Design a protein around this ligand. Structure first.
Ligand SMILES: [Cl-]
Ligand SMILES: [Cl-]
Ligand SMILES: [Cl-]
Ligand SMILES: [Cl-]
Ligand SMILES: [Cl-]
Ligand SMILES: [Cl-]
Lengths: 277, 276, 277, 277, 274
C-alpha cells in the first residue's frame, strides 16, 4: 500500500466520531472523557476569531504539546492555508493530524500546501465536490465541509453536504463518455472523479463541520451521510460543555435513534447564541 | 390513507385559535381562554426579530412541561429542512410539528419530507403554488406566513387574498388551461385539480403573522380562513388572559359586529410592534 | 333618494366646518366649545404616529364611546385602509362617520373597504382626481386631501387641492368625445367623471387635511375651494389649543376677511414646530 | 329598450354567422349565396393593405352603394379609428353597420369615435377585456378580436379570445370587494365590469377576426366561445372562392361536428399562403 | 384509457417513421420497412426555406396515404389547434403529432390530448417539457432536434439532456425530488414514476436533423426507441435506397460492419444548412 493509502487508512479510524476544539489541557481531558475520537488544539475558537478579528495563526507549539500530553486520543492542530512551514513545525511536534484550515487567516491566496510532502495526514475543507477532489489530489487524507464557522447556524454545512453528496450521486449513473466534461466543469482531476464514481462516495473520510451546535444538528449531519463531525464553538461556548460534549458524542453514535436523541437533548442548558447571517 | 388520516385530524382545529406559549402558566391561560391548541416555544417571533441569534427547536424538557400542563393539542416548531429536529419532536409525543420560517432556516433548498412521519405537520405559505408544494411534501395543514413579530396584518391579508384569489380563478378556469396554470404555479397538477374540484385548499388553512387584535382575527375569518395563529400579539400585550379570550371569541363570532365591539371594548395596550 | 345620496347629504351638513382630532373627552369638549363641526376620536395624533412609529390601528371602542358621550356634535373615527372589520366595529359603536385613513398603518395594500356595505358614511383621502373618484365609486361620501400628515407643512395639501380642482376645471369645458380617454388616463369610472363634469365640482363634500397649522393655512384652503378643513396635530401640539382652536374655526368661517384673519392670528402663541421634508 | 339596447339587439341577429369581406358586387353575391350573415364592403382586403402599404381610408360611397344594392343581407363598412366624419358619411349611405377598424390607417391616435352619437350600430376591435369594455362604453354594439390582419395566422386571434374569455371567467367568481381594483387595472368602467360579471359574458355580441384561413380555424374560434367570425383575406384568392366560403359558413354552423368539418375541408384547394410574423 | 394509448405506441419501438407527401412515397417507405408514415404536404426543409403559414394537411391527401399503406399513418396538427386534431381523428388515422414544425396556433397552451381516443406524439427539448406533454396526454415523445437543416447537433443535445436528467433522477435522494420537480416545472407524480421506471414512461424517439444512417444509429446508441426522418430522405438519386439504409441502421445500430455496408455508395445526402 502507498504512503497516501496509509494516511487514508489512518483517518478511517475516526469514523463514527466527534472531533472537539480545545484550548487547554483541562478541556482536552473533558473532550476525551465525554468520548471524543480526537481533539483539535487551538488558542482561539472560530466564534472568537469571528468576533475579535486579528490575524489567526498556528498555535504556540508549547500549548499543543501540553494538550498532546494530557490525552491519549489523537491530537490535531491547524495551519493556515498555504503555510507549509507552519505544517512542518506541527509535524515535527509529533501530533497526529494537520487541519489546513480556512478559519485561520489565509497565508497563500492561490495555492494550498503540497500535502504529499508530509508524513502526517491532513484534513482540508470543501464546499463542493470539485474542491474536495482538488484537496485530495494535493494530498488531503480527510475532507470536511467548511460550513459556516463561528455562528452556530447549520445551514451552510447542510448546503455543502448536499452539494458534495448530490454530485457524487449524479456521477454514479452518469454515461462514462460524459465524465470528461463533468471533470472539466468541476475543475477536478479526471482520475479522482472516476475513482469517486466507482466507489460511490469520496475516496477519503468525510466529516461535517461548521455550525454544529446541538445534538440534533450532529445527528442530521450523520443522516445526510457524513462519517463524523467536528465541533468547535458549539461546546465550550455553551452553558454546560461536559454534558453538551457527551450529548453530541451520543448523538453521533446513535444518530438514527430518536428516543436516544430526545434523552441527550433533554434539559441541555443554553446552546451557543451565535449569529444569523 | 395515512395522509388522509392526518388531514382528517387537523379538521378538529377549524374555528380555533392556536396560541404561542413559553411556559406552562401561559399554556394554562391559553387553554382557559379557549385556545384550540398551543404552540410551545422558548422565543416568541417579536423577540426572535428584536434579539436575532440562531433560533432552533425548543428544549424537549420545556415542551414536555407544556404538554403535561394542558389537555388541548400541543404543537412545536422545527427549523425548515431540519428533519432530525422533527424526529425528536415526534418522539416526545406532541400532536403537531410546525416546520417554521420564524426559526432559522436549516436547509435553503429542501423542506422536510413530511410523509416519513406519523405526526401531522403545519407549513407556511405566501401563495397557492407554495401551499400546494408543502401539501405534496406531506403538510396536513397550511398557514399564511404573514409578517412575523410586527403586529402588522398587511402581509397576512396579502397572502390570504393571494391564495384565495388564485383558488377562485382556478375554479372556473377552462380545463385545458390548467396545465399551464400548474406550470406557472410550479405546483403538482394533481393537487391543482383537486383544489379546483374542491374550491378550496385540500387541507385546513389558518391565518398567521401579525394578528394583534380581535378585529384582525375576525378579518381573517371573513376572508375565508379556518382559524388563526397568534404569537406575539397576546403575551406581548398589556393583559394577555383577557386579550386571549377576546381573540377566541372574535374567531367564534367573526360575523357579529356587536360581539366584536364587546370583546374589543377596554382591552388595554395591544403590542406596539414595528411598521416595516 | 338612494342610500348613497342620503350619506352624501349627511356629510353636506359639515360644510363650512373644522373637524378636530381629539384624544380624550376634555379635548372633545374644548373642540366643541371652540365651534368644531365634528371631532375625530383617536389614541394618537399624526405628528406622534410619525415620530414614534409602531403599528397604528383603530382606537379602543371604550375611548371612542367616552368621546361620543362627551359631546353633542358628530363623532368620527379612523379605520385602517382595507380593514373592513375595524369599520364594522366602529359602525356598531354608533358613531357618525368612519375615516378610512392613510395615517393609520395600511392593512390591505391592493383594496380599500367596500364602503357601500355600510350604513355609516365614510371619508377617504386623495391626492388627485382619479383617486377621489375611485374612493367615491367604492362608496366614500366625503373626500379629503391627504396633504402631508404630522409635519405642519401645508405644501402637499396645496398641491393636492390644486391637482383635484385643476383637473375638475379641465373637465368642465372638455370636448365630450375626449372624456372617454380622460377617464382612462385618470383610471376613474366614466360615469363619475361625467357627473363631475356636469356639476363642475366633486359630487361629494371635499375638505382639506394634512399640515393645516395656522389660521392663514385654513383660510388658504377655503380660498382654494375646499368645503372645510381637518386639523389634527396643528392644535393640541401647539402652545394654546383652546385659543388656537377657536382661531381656526373663525378663519374657516371668515376666510375672505383679512381683518378678521389678522385679529384671530394676533398673539396666538407657539404653532407646532413640525418638520420640513 | 334604450337606443343602445336596440343596437345591441340588432347585432344579436348575426350570432352563428360569418361576415365576409367583399370588394365588388359579384363577390357580395357569392358571399350571400354561400350563406354569409353579412358582407363588409371595402376597396382593399387586409392582406393587400399589409403588402402594398399606402393610406387606407373609407371606401368610395359609390362602391358601397353597388354592394348594398346587390344583396339582401346586412352590409357593413369600415371607417378609420377616430374618423367620425367617415362614419357620418357611411351612416348617411344607409348601410347597416360601421366597423371602426384598425386595418384602415389610424386617424386619431388618442380618441375613438363617440359611437353613441350615431343611430347605426358599430363594431370595434379588441385584444383584451379592458379594451372591449372601453369600446362598449364609447357605444360599440358588437366586438371583435383584432387578431392579426392579413397573415392567415390564427395565433393572435386565439391569444385575444383566450385573454378576453379568461378574464371574464376570473371576474365571474371574484370577491366583489376586489372588483374595484380589477376595474382600475383593466382601465375599464366599473359598471360595465359588474355587468360582465353578472352576465358571465360580454354584454354584446363577440366575433373572432384576423387570420381565420380554414374551416378548422373558424370552428376553433366557435369552440373557444365566439358568437361568429369575420373572414377577409382568407377567402377570395381561390380555385373556387365560392367553395371556401361555403365551407367556412358550414364550419361555423356545425362547429362541434368533426365529421362535417372533415367533409367541408376535404379537397378545398390552396388556402392563402400568408406570412409568419 | 391512457395506458392503452401508451401500449399501442410501444409497438413502434425499433422503428423508423418517415415523412411522406404522396401515396408513391408512402409505398416506398412501407417497402423499405418503415414502422409508420407521417403524412404531410410540406417537408420541414421546405417549410424553413419557403416560410408561409404551415397548417394541417388537406384531409384528401391524408386519406390517399392511409389507403396506400397498411402500416400506421400519423399526421401533424398545429400546437394548440385542437380542431385540426378533431378533424384528423375523424379521418381515421392512427396518431396525431402536435408539431412545432407547423405554425404555432396557441402560444400558451397545448392541446388537451386526453380528450381524444387517438394517441398523440409531442416534441420536447428537456425532461420537464417531456413530462408536461405527457401529463397533457401525449402517448409518445420525440426530441425536437432542429428541423429542416440536416444537422444532428440539437437532437444530440436534447437526447443527452432528457436521458441525463433521468439518470440524475434515478439515484437522487427522495427528499430532494420535490425541489427537482419544482425546478423542472413538471408534475411531481410523473417525476416519481420516471424515477421508479428509470426511463420515460412513454416511447421516446429522436427527431430533427437525422440525415444519414450514422446519425440514426447514433440516436439509438444514445438510448432512443426509434427515429423520425423527414427531409433527410426523399430528395435523392435512389430515395428508396436511403430509406432502407436508415431502417437497417436502426435495426442493426450496434453493428459497425452493417453500418459500413448500408452507408457505402449512398448518393448525395441533403445539403442542409449550418
Ligand atoms: Cl482570510
Ligand atoms: Cl434565516
Ligand atoms: Cl403604512
Ligand atoms: Cl396606422
Ligand atoms: Cl363606470
Ligand atoms: Cl411559429
Amino acid at each position: 500500500k502507498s504512503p497516501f493509502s496509509v494516511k487514508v487508512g489512518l483517518a478511517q479510524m475516526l469514523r463514527g466520531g466527534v472531533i472537539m476544539d480545545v484550548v487547554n489541557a483541562e478541556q482536552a481531558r473533558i473532550a476525551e472523557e465525554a468520548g471524543a475520537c480526537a481533539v483539535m488544539a487551538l488558542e482561539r475558537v472560530p466564534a472568537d476569531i469571528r468576533a475579535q478579528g486579528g490575524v489567526a495563526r498556528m498555535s504556540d507549539p508549547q500549548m499543543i504539546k501540553e494538550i498532546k500530553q494530557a490525552v491519549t486520543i489523537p491530537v490535531m492542530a491547524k495551519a493556515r492555508i498555504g503555510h507549509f512551514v507552519e505544517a512542518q513545525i506541527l509535524e515535527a511536534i509529533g501530533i497526529d493530524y494537520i487541519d489546513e484550515s480556512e478559519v485561520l487567516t489565509l497565508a497563500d491566496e492561490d495555492h494550498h500546501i503540497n500535502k504529499h510532502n508530509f508524513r502526517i495526514p491532513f484534513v482540508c475543507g470543501c464546499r463542493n465536490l470539485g474542491e474536495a477532489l482538488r484537496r485530495i489530489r494535493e494530498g488531503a487524507a480527510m475532507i470536511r465541509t467548511k460550513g459556516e464557522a463561528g455562528t452556530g447556524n447549520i445551514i451552510e454545512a447542510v448546503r455543502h453536504v448536499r452539494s458534495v453528496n448530490g454530485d457524487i450521486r449524479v456521477l454514479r449513473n452518469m454515461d462514462d463518455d460524459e465524465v470528461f466534461t463533468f471533470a472539466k466543469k468541476l475543475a477536478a482531476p479526471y482520475d479522482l472523479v472516476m475513482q469517486t464514481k466507482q466507489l460511490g462516495r469520496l475516496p477519503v473520510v468525510q466529516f461535517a463541520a461548521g455550525g454544529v451546535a446541538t445534538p440534533a444538528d450532529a445527528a442530521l449531519m450523520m443522516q445526510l451521510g457524513c462519517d463524523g463531525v467536528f465541533v468547535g464553538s458549539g461546546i465550550f461556548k455553551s452553558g454546560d460543555p461536559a454534558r453538551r460534549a457527551r450529548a453530541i458524542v451520543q448523538a453521533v453514535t446513535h444518530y438514527s435513534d430518536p428516543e436516544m436523541l430526545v434523552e441527550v437533548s433533554c434539559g441541555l442548558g443554553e446552546a451557543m447564541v451565535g449569529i444569523n447571517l
